[PDB]
Amino acid sequence: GLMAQMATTAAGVAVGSAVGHTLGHAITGGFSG
Amino acid sequence: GLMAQMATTAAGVAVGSAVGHTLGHAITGGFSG
Amino acid sequence: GLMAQMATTAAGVAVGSAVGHTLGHAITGGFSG
Amino acid sequence: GLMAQMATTAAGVAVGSAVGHTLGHAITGGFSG
Amino acid sequence: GLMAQMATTAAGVAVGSAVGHTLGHAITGGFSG
Amino acid sequence: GLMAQMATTAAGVAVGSAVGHTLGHAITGGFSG
């Protein structure tokens, strides 16, 4: 599926393998004034 | 599925393998003034 | 499923393997003034 | 410094604000066979 | 410094604000056979 | 400094604001057979 070999010295965010998914109905609110 | 081999020295956030998912109905509120 | 081999020296947050999911109906409140 | 306002429904890993740092001497071992 | 306003429904990894830094001497091992 | 307003429905990795830096001496190992 997902494979990662990572060598990092400094990182704000370090991620090897990651999945995000929505099935069905998903609603994300936006930005309003 | 998900495999990660990570070598890191400094990280704000370090994650090997991660999954986030919604099934069915998901509503996220936004930002309003 | 999820496998992680991580070597880290300093991390704000270090996570090997993690899953978060919602099934059915999920509502997250947003930010309002 | 670091400020975060996050609305999330499902996440493997959810982090608002995070710092990781090394001062001086830091050695991270790698992967060998 | 760092500011984030994030609305997300599904994420493998969700991070608002993050810093990773090394000061001085940092050595990260690599991958060898 | 860094500001982010992000609306996302599905993401493998979602990051608002992030900084990674090395000061001084940093060595990252590579990949060898």
Author numbering:
A (entry chain G), B (entry chain E), C (entry chain F), D (entry chain B), E (entry chain A), F (entry chain C): 54 to 86
Q: Can you provide the manuscript's text about this entry?
A:
Structures of D10 and D2 fibrils assembled in vitro from the low complexity N-terminal domains of each protein show that their core comprises the most highly conserved region between the two proteins. For D10 and D2, the central conserved VAV motif forms a beta-strand that is associated with the protofilament interface in all the structures we have observed, suggesting that it may be a critical element in fibril formation and may be expected to appear in ex vivo structures as well.
The core ordered region of each D2-NT PF consists of D2 residues G54–G86. A sequence alignment of D10 and D2 shows that this region corresponds to residues G43–G75 of D10 and features only 5 sequence differences between the two proteins. Strand-1 adopts a very similar conformation to that observed in the D10-NT PF1 structure, as do the last five residues of strand-3, and the two strands pack together in a nearly identical manner in both structures, with residue F73(D10)/F84(D2) packing against the equivalent Q47(D10)/Q58(D2) residue. In addition to this, strand-2 of the D2-NT is superposable on the corresponding VAV sequence of all three D10-NT PFs and forms the central part of the PF interface both in the D2-NT structure and in D10-NT polymorph-1.
